[PDB]
Amino acid sequence: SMYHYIEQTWQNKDWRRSILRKRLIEWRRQPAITRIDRPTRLNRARALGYKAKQGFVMVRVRVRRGGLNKPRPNSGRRPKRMGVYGYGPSKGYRWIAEERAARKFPNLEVLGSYYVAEDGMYKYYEVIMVDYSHPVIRSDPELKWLQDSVNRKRVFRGLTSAGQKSRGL
Amino acid sequence: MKVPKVIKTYCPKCKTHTEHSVSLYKGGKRRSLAEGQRRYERKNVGYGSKRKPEQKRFAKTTKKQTLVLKCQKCSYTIVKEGMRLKKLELVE
RNA sequence: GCCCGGAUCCGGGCACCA
RNA sequence: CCGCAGCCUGGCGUUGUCCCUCGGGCGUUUAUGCGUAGAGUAGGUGGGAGGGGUCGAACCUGUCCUUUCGGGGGCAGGGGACCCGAAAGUGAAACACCACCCAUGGACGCUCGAGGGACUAACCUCUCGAAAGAGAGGAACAACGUCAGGUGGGCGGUUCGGC
RNA sequence: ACCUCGGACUAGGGGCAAAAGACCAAUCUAGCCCGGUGAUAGCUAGUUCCCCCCGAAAUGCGUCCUAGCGCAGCCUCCCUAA
RNA sequence: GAGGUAGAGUACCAUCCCCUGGUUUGGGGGUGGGAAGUUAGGGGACACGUGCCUCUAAGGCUAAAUAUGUCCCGAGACCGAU
RNA sequence: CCCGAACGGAAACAUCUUAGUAGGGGGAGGAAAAGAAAUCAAUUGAGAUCCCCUGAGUAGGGGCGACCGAAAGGGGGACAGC
């Protein structure tokens, strides 16, 4: 399939990593949460459940890498509980990126994510989101589970793929 | 105190009195990967105070001098109880 | 326990949870 | 008694293009050597008294480099051909030839570093622009993330024996 | 560097101080409310009916121990044993 | 009988931090490196090798068995105006 | 689902415990969450998840101090799979 060859050009250590560097220069200027027209990696999107119907949207999110933005305590602590450096959010940056996308698009449900790039200050992810109220999605037989109100806003309760991994499941 | 280099005592392997060569005891290297050194390093990761007690007050000035005797026929070694002295002058 | 310098000892900087 | 922030410094990442130099190594390339007794430069282990000789030698005369100028190492011609000992000294002899070592310097192809210089397109700063985008200056440093060492009553927890 | 009024800003290990540890709603060498929380107290006070039988110790050693405890000594109750 | 397919910054490694009974062995996160891909991968209490045994990560969904009590019915060696 | 103490106990106290508790922020439902083995155990066996009685204060962690602490297996309740 052509999807097998998409993953080969974007694989590991390649001349393609000269093309991808040029994109990053543009991506650093666009807003931190943007809707994009088409997935950058169709192999990753189609495996996670993206289709070419209307109601599927693609969002790119950039976050800031590093550890937790943790302040030094100001009241009295034992020496164990006074340390700052080395802490990272037990939630992954992949799960943090999905959460910020679900804030800006409150009518869509997160289906998956994968990252696309990385530089010295940010990490970039792309999130697959679907509109559960469009009549095209409402009639789909493979997403009939998405008509249950318990299956909405799952990203906030750790029920996505990135959340299951981080819960030790 | 002076002690000879060679002493004739009982070799329990040979079951008789044989010649022995005399030396003073000296310890080895601490050998990281000892179980109590693996545990100490596992305890020093993270945040906290000084983890373990460390001696500060010292009273003794000498140390117990131990003699090591090696049986010159079979290399069997007997280690003797120590005794508080200044420095055992082992020269013959 | 070290390195190093100086006449086994001395000095300097680092090693060292009964 | 201890911790933790802040600060200083180094590694890794973001971080790229051209050089030059130096120091390591790998397979090669080569030519250079005086504790004393003595024909005299024994630095050492061996084959080796034969090795060179129209299968062209010992010798005078100079250009030249060098050294504890001691003295040896290389130049063609004049010479158409000669010297070391198996012999004399040395705790260890043959400039009798050939090998390796200690040890000097340079060069080939490869690797690793370490330093210095330049550049602009990342990154940063400013200006214009509603935005899109354009211009100027700096620049692979700064800045940020992460790890490591130092400093650190700035702040936090505590201990401050007994009779 | 005068006195005073209305509006506004600064919030608790924080503010504001022509500096007294002053002031921050009669509260300040760290405000108040609610929660942790019925915090801990070898220390102090109280601890509610009758009769009957037996009946002490204020000593030794160890203890960051001498206003406390552990091990022995001394009281009481039961079984055995012969 | 012959051929084709099987989920990537993912598994894993070093280091730092927090959890954990997880201890030279478990889980998650930050930083750096980073596969194989069916002639493949994972696991079988330190690490590796050889047999044997067992499974298929990195894409979702899924009744019943249970947790609660604002509320409605019933019950009770509950209280009885401090 | 993330962030996250101290009082107290250790007869002092800092690793530890208290406790991932109290608390803070975000998101649901009449239930939530989990859920169809890259699982267990051992001479080649069992067979998704959850809850109760056990295994068991066992293996194991710890100034190896105070203290902390499983899973497999056995008996049951429901017992689907795409």
Coordinates of N, CA, C and O (backbone and C1' of nucleotides) in Angstrom, one line a residue, chain E residues 11-58:
Chain E
rA11 P -1.2 41.7 47.1 O5' -1.4 41.5 48.6 C5' -0.4 41.3 49.6 C4' -0.7 40.3 50.6 C3' -1.5 39.1 50.2 O3' -1.0 38.0 50.9 C1' -2.8 40.2 51.7
rG12 P -0.2 36.7 50.2 O5' 0.3 35.9 51.5 C5' -0.6 35.6 52.5 C4' 0.2 35.4 53.8 C3' -0.4 34.3 54.8 O3' 0.7 33.7 55.4 C1' -0.3 36.4 55.9
rG13 P 1.4 32.4 54.8 O5' 2.5 32.9 53.9 C5' 3.8 32.4 53.9 C4' 4.9 33.5 53.9 C3' 6.3 33.0 53.7 O3' 7.1 34.1 53.1 C1' 6.1 33.7 55.9
rG14 P 7.1 34.3 51.6 O5' 5.9 35.4 51.3 C5' 6.0 36.8 51.7 C4' 4.8 37.5 51.5 C3' 4.7 39.0 51.7 O3' 5.4 39.8 50.7 C1' 2.8 38.1 52.6
rG15 P 6.3 41.1 51.2 O5' 5.2 42.3 51.1 C5' 4.2 42.3 50.2 C4' 3.0 43.1 50.6 C3' 3.3 44.6 51.0 O3' 3.4 45.4 49.9 C1' 2.0 43.5 52.7
rC16 P 4.1 46.8 50.0 O5' 3.2 47.7 50.9 C5' 3.3 49.1 51.1 C4' 3.2 49.5 52.5 C3' 4.4 50.0 53.2 O3' 4.8 51.3 52.8 C1' 3.4 48.5 54.6
rA17 P 6.3 51.8 52.9 O5' 6.6 51.9 54.4 C5' 6.0 52.8 55.3 C4' 6.3 52.6 56.7 C3' 7.7 52.8 57.1 O3' 8.0 54.2 57.4 C1' 6.9 50.8 58.0
rA18 P 8.5 55.2 56.2 O5' 9.3 56.2 57.0 C5' 10.6 56.0 57.5 C4' 11.1 57.0 58.5 C3' 10.2 57.1 59.7 O3' 10.6 56.1 60.7 C1' 10.7 59.3 58.9
rA19 P 9.6 55.6 61.8 O5' 10.3 54.3 62.4 C5' 10.5 54.0 63.8 C4' 11.3 52.8 64.0 C3' 12.8 53.0 64.0 O3' 13.4 52.1 64.8 C1' 12.2 51.6 62.2
rA20 P 13.8 52.4 66.4 O5' 12.5 51.9 67.1 C5' 12.4 52.0 68.5 C4' 11.1 51.4 69.0 C3' 10.8 50.0 68.6 O3' 11.5 49.0 69.5 C1' 8.9 51.3 68.2
rG21 P 12.3 47.9 68.9 O5' 11.3 47.0 68.1 C5' 10.2 46.3 68.7 C4' 9.2 45.9 67.8 C3' 8.3 44.8 68.3 O3' 7.1 45.2 69.0 C1' 9.1 44.2 66.1
rA22 P 6.9 46.6 69.8 O5' 6.4 47.6 68.6 C5' 5.0 47.4 68.1 C4' 4.7 48.6 67.3 C3' 3.4 48.5 66.5 O3' 2.2 48.7 67.2 C1' 5.1 49.3 65.1
rC23 P 1.1 47.5 67.4 O5' 0.2 47.7 66.1 C5' -0.4 48.9 65.8 C4' -0.7 49.0 64.3 C3' -1.4 47.8 63.7 O3' -2.7 47.7 64.0 C1' 0.4 48.5 62.3
rC24 P -3.4 46.3 64.0 O5' -3.6 45.9 62.5 C5' -4.2 46.8 61.6 C4' -4.2 46.2 60.2 C3' -4.7 44.8 60.1 O3' -6.1 44.6 60.2 C1' -2.8 45.1 58.8
rA25 P -6.8 43.5 61.0 O5' -8.0 44.1 61.7 C5' -7.9 45.3 62.6 C4' -9.2 45.7 63.1 C3' -10.1 44.5 63.6 O3' -10.9 45.0 64.7 C1' -11.2 45.7 61.9
rA26 P -10.6 44.4 66.2 O5' -11.0 45.6 67.1 C5' -10.0 46.6 67.4 C4' -9.5 46.5 68.8 C3' -9.0 45.2 69.3 O3' -7.9 45.4 70.2 C1' -10.8 45.9 70.7
rU27 P -6.4 45.0 69.6 O5' -6.5 43.5 69.3 C5' -6.0 42.5 70.1 C4' -5.8 41.2 69.4 C3' -4.6 41.2 68.4 O3' -3.4 41.0 69.0 C1' -6.5 40.0 67.6
rC28 P -2.4 42.2 69.4 O5' -0.9 41.7 69.0 C5' -0.6 40.3 69.0 C4' 0.4 40.0 68.0 C3' 1.5 41.1 67.7 O3' 2.7 40.5 67.4 C1' 0.3 40.6 65.7
rU29 P 4.0 40.6 68.4 O5' 5.0 39.5 67.9 C5' 5.5 39.5 66.5 C4' 6.4 38.3 66.3 C3' 6.2 37.2 67.3 O3' 6.4 36.0 66.6 C1' 8.4 38.0 67.5
rA30 P 5.2 34.9 66.5 O5' 4.4 35.3 65.3 C5' 3.3 36.2 65.4 C4' 2.7 36.4 64.0 C3' 2.0 35.1 63.4 O3' 0.9 35.5 62.6 C1' 3.8 35.9 62.0
rG31 P -0.4 34.7 62.6 O5' -1.6 35.8 62.5 C5' -1.8 36.8 63.5 C4' -3.0 37.6 63.2 C3' -4.3 36.7 63.2 O3' -4.8 36.6 64.5 C1' -4.2 38.1 61.3
rC32 P -5.5 35.2 65.0 O5' -6.9 35.1 64.3 C5' -7.9 36.1 64.6 C4' -8.9 36.1 63.5 C3' -9.6 34.8 63.2 O3' -10.6 34.6 64.1 C1' -8.9 35.7 61.2
rC33 P -11.2 33.1 64.4 O5' -11.8 32.6 63.0 C5' -13.2 32.9 62.8 C4' -13.6 32.3 61.5 C3' -13.6 30.8 61.4 O3' -14.8 30.2 62.0 C1' -12.6 31.6 59.5
rC34 P -14.7 28.9 62.9 O5' -14.7 27.7 61.9 C5' -15.7 27.5 61.0 C4' -15.2 26.7 59.8 C3' -14.6 25.4 60.1 O3' -15.4 24.3 60.4 C1' -13.4 26.5 58.4
rG35 P -14.9 23.1 61.3 O5' -13.9 22.3 60.3 C5' -14.3 21.3 59.4 C4' -13.2 21.0 58.4 C3' -12.1 20.0 58.9 O3' -12.5 18.6 58.9 C1' -11.1 21.8 57.9
rG36 P -12.0 17.7 60.1 O5' -10.5 17.5 59.8 C5' -10.0 16.7 58.7 C4' -8.5 16.6 58.7 C3' -7.8 16.0 60.0 O3' -7.9 14.6 60.0 C1' -6.6 17.9 59.3
rU37 P -7.9 13.9 61.4 O5' -9.0 14.6 62.2 C5' -9.5 14.1 63.5 C4' -9.8 15.2 64.5 C3' -10.7 16.3 63.9 O3' -11.5 16.9 64.9 C1' -8.7 17.2 64.7
rG38 P -12.9 16.3 65.3 O5' -12.8 15.9 66.9 C5' -12.3 16.9 67.8 C4' -11.5 16.2 68.9 C3' -10.3 15.4 68.4 O3' -9.2 15.5 69.3 C1' -11.8 14.1 69.7
rA39 P -8.2 16.8 69.3 O5' -6.9 16.2 68.8 C5' -6.8 15.2 67.9 C4' -5.3 15.1 67.4 C3' -4.3 14.6 68.4 O3' -4.2 13.2 68.5 C1' -3.6 16.6 67.3
rU40 P -4.4 12.5 69.9 O5' -3.1 12.8 70.7 C5' -1.9 12.0 70.5 C4' -0.7 12.7 71.1 C3' -0.7 12.8 72.6 O3' -0.3 11.6 73.3 C1' -0.1 14.8 71.7
rA41 P -1.1 11.1 74.5 O5' -0.5 11.9 75.8 C5' 0.9 12.0 76.0 C4' 1.2 13.2 76.8 C3' 0.7 13.3 78.2 O3' 1.5 12.7 79.1 C1' 0.4 15.4 77.0
rG42 P 1.4 11.1 79.5 O5' 2.3 11.1 80.9 C5' 2.6 9.8 81.5 C4' 3.9 10.0 82.3 C3' 4.2 11.4 82.8 O3' 4.8 11.3 84.1 C1' 6.0 10.4 81.6
rC43 P 3.9 11.8 85.4 O5' 3.4 13.2 85.1 C5' 4.2 14.4 85.5 C4' 3.5 15.7 85.2 C3' 2.1 15.9 85.9 O3' 2.3 16.4 87.2 C1' 2.0 16.5 83.6
rU44 P 1.4 15.7 88.4 O5' 0.0 16.6 88.4 C5' 0.0 17.9 88.9 C4' -1.2 18.6 88.5 C3' -2.6 18.1 88.9 O3' -2.9 18.4 90.3 C1' -2.7 18.7 86.6
rA45 P -3.7 17.3 91.2 O5' -5.2 17.5 90.7 C5' -6.0 18.7 91.1 C4' -7.3 18.7 90.3 C3' -8.2 17.6 90.5 O3' -9.0 17.6 91.7 C1' -8.1 18.1 88.2
rG46 P -9.3 16.2 92.5 O5' -10.6 15.7 91.8 C5' -11.8 16.4 91.8 C4' -12.8 15.9 90.7 C3' -13.2 14.4 90.8 O3' -14.2 14.1 91.7 C1' -12.5 14.9 88.6
rU47 P -14.3 12.7 92.4 O5' -14.4 11.7 91.3 C5' -15.7 11.4 90.7 C4' -15.6 10.3 89.6 C3' -15.3 8.9 90.1 O3' -16.4 8.2 90.5 C1' -13.8 9.5 88.3
rU48 P -16.4 7.5 92.0 O5' -17.9 7.4 92.4 C5' -18.6 8.5 93.0 C4' -20.1 8.4 92.9 C3' -20.6 7.0 93.1 O3' -21.9 7.0 93.7 C1' -21.2 7.8 90.9
rC49 P -22.0 6.8 95.3 O5' -21.6 5.2 95.5 C5' -22.2 4.2 94.8 C4' -23.2 3.4 95.6 C3' -22.7 2.4 96.6 O3' -22.3 3.1 97.9 C1' -24.3 1.3 95.3
rC50 P -21.4 2.3 98.9 O5' -22.2 1.1 99.5 C5' -22.9 1.2 100.7 C4' -23.5 -0.1 101.2 C3' -22.5 -1.1 101.8 O3' -22.1 -0.7 103.1 C1' -23.8 -2.2 100.2
rC51 P -20.6 -1.0 103.5 O5' -20.6 -2.6 103.9 C5' -21.5 -3.1 104.9 C4' -21.7 -4.6 104.8 C3' -20.4 -5.4 105.0 O3' -20.1 -5.6 106.4 C1' -21.5 -6.1 103.0
rC52 P -18.6 -5.7 106.8 O5' -18.0 -7.1 106.3 C5' -18.5 -8.3 106.8 C4' -18.1 -9.5 106.0 C3' -16.6 -9.8 105.9 O3' -16.1 -10.5 107.0 C1' -17.5 -9.9 103.7
rC53 P -14.7 -10.1 107.6 O5' -13.7 -10.9 106.7 C5' -13.7 -12.3 106.6 C4' -12.7 -12.8 105.6 C3' -11.3 -12.3 105.7 O3' -10.5 -12.8 106.7 C1' -12.0 -12.3 103.4
rC54 P -9.4 -11.9 107.5 O5' -8.2 -11.9 106.5 C5' -7.5 -13.1 106.0 C4' -6.7 -12.9 104.8 C3' -5.6 -11.8 105.0 O3' -4.5 -12.2 105.7 C1' -6.7 -11.5 102.9
rG55 P -3.6 -11.2 106.5 O5' -3.1 -10.1 105.4 C5' -2.1 -10.4 104.5 C4' -1.9 -9.3 103.5 C3' -1.4 -8.0 104.2 O3' -0.1 -8.0 104.5 C1' -3.2 -7.5 102.7
rA56 P 0.5 -6.8 105.5 O5' 0.7 -5.6 104.6 C5' 2.0 -5.1 104.3 C4' 2.3 -5.4 102.8 C3' 3.5 -4.6 102.3 O3' 4.7 -5.1 102.6 C1' 1.7 -4.5 100.8
rA57 P 5.9 -4.2 103.1 O5' 6.4 -3.4 101.9 C5' 6.7 -4.1 100.7 C4' 7.0 -3.1 99.6 C3' 7.9 -1.9 100.0 O3' 9.3 -2.3 99.9 C1' 6.0 -1.1 98.9
rA58 P 10.4 -1.4 100.7 O5' 10.5 -0.1 99.8 C5' 11.0 1.1 100.3 C4' 10.6 2.3 99.5 C3' 10.9 3.6 100.1 O3' 12.2 4.0 99.8 C1' 8.7 3.6 99.4

